[PDB]
């Protein structure tokens, strides 16, 4: 028989929504998920899945379905995918080349980009090296470009590694906030629990 559902609403509707440099993660325990509810909804801008055919997601069983969440510049949203590179795919949140989860992204211009500018959402540049898959970089070490080490000093060739977005109420479909949620599946052995509605 049908029973409790998964907390998709808690992570989709939600409230003040995690920035990108520390992308929010949520583990979904034993539950039943209704993906068709998300599929049929037209509010979503892009619903692109790199694993199995979305149309029958409701007929496979997983164990450890993860949900990542963050916010991106509207134009630069096609970087949440394997291989792609950039400020959101190379330094902040890079999917593994072998990926088996869907990516969902929808516009939220009205909910953000206040008249005075949101200027709260932060994105990470200036990483000493690359980023391994599914790596969160919450540290705030001051970056340098060669020269001489700066021991917490701030100045030329020693920069803070985070920047604030420039959301404005009328920027365009390009520079508008987009909320992205990555539903990454998993079959890490052990009994499967996250099955279809049946």
């Amino acid at each position, epitope marked *: 028989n049908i029973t409790n559902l998964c907390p998709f609403g808690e992570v989709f509707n939600a409230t003040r929504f995690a920035s990108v440099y520390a992308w929010n993660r949520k583990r979904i325990s034993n539950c039943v998920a209704d993906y068709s509810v998300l599929y049929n909804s037209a509010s979503f801008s892009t619903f692109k899945c790199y694993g199995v055919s979305p149309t029958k997601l409701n007929d496979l069983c997983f164990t450890n379905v993860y949900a990542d969440s963050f916010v991106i*510049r509207g134009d*630069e949203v096609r970087q949440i995918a394997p291989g792609q*590179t*950039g*400020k959101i795919a*190379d330094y902040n949140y890079k999917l593994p080349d072998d990926f088996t989860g869907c990516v969902i992204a929808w516009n939220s211009n009205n909910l953000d980009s206040k008249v005075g500018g949101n200027y709260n959402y932060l994105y990470r*540049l*200036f*990483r*000493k*090296s690359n980023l391994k898959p599914f790596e969160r970089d919450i540290s705030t070490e001051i970056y340098q*470009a*060669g*020269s001489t080490p700066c021991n917490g000093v701030e*100045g*030329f*060739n020693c*920069y803070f590694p985070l*920047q*604030s*977005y*420039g959301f404005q109420p009328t920027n365009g479909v390009g*520079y508008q906030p987009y909320r992205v949620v990555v539903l990454s599946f998993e079959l890490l052995h052990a009994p499967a629990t996250v099955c279809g509605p049946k």
Partner: antibody, heavy 127, light 109 residues
Framework: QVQLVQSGSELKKPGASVKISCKAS????????INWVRQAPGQGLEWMGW????????TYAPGFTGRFVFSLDTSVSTAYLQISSLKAEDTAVYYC?????????????????????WGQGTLVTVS | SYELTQDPAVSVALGQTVRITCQGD??????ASWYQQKPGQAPVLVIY???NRPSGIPDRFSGSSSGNTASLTITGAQAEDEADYYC????????????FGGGTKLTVL
């Protein structure tokens, strides 16, 4: 001790091609774009283009196709400029520049769109 | 979005504060940066961010921005600046991520 050094002066006849090399030392070369600029005697600098030192795909400024090719050797940390089908009105001094950002779209703030360190530059002359 | 006009005729007193002005219609919602270029030598920056001096020579160089105008300023020892000063800034319209102004030929008696 960041240091960018170009190749020496190059002489060639009109219509041929010129290869220009500039290499950078003292920092992680892979984490900085390489910008290009030209200057003619008595005339101000003009933007040429940039190379993302991760893939290489340039974004040439309008009208600079075919005559200019950008390349990079990461294993040696060097940048190369090819100027084929040269014209007498192309003699100039060329500089390659580093930028604190990997590319230009990375930083959407506009507070780092500047070139920090340059080299001596290469004089290309023909007749 | 195409050029940043300037004026290459700056020479005033050789012993007083000197100003360099740049006008650009695409400088309100953006930043600016200032270089110097001694004849032939490799040019290097003198101001980044319009306020933050560099480690090179942060002694007698200052910068300010007022609306569409960018202003560089020198204070003392005006000599040793027989040079050419150039500007940079972000740009819009998806045509040129950066552009360069005409440049100013700072000459001091």
């Amino acid at each position: 001790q960041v240091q960018l050094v170009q190749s020496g002066s190059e002489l060639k006849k009109p219509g041929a091609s010129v290869k220009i090399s500039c290499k950078a030392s003292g920092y992680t070369f892979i984490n900085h774009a390489i910008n290009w600029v030209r200057q003619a005697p008595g005339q101000g600098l003009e933007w040429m283009g940039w190379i993302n030192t991760n893939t290489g795909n340039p974004t040439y400024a309008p009208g600079f196709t075919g005559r200019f090719v950008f390349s990079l050797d990461t294993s040696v940390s060097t940048a190369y400029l090819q100027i084929s089908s040269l014209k007498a009105e192309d003699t100039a001094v060329y500089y390659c520049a580093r930028i604190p950002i990997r590319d230009y779209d990375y930083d959407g703030s506009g507070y780092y769109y500047f070139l920090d360190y340059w080299g001596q530059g290469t004089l290309v002359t023909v007749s | 979005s195409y050029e940043l006009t300037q004026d290459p005729a700056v020479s005033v007193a050789l012993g007083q504060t000197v100003r360099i002005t740049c006008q650009g219609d695409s400088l309100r919602s953006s930043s600016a940066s200032w270089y110097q270029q001694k004849p032939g030598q490799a040019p290097v920056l003198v101001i980044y961010g319009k306020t933050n001096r560099p480690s090179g020579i942060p002694d007698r160089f200052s910068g300010s921005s007022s609306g569409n105008t960018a202003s560089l300023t020198i204070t003392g020892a005006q000599a040793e600046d027989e040079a050419d000063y150039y500007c940079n800034s972000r740009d819009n319209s998806g045509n040129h991520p950066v552009v360069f102004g005409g440049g100013t030929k700072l000459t001091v008696l």
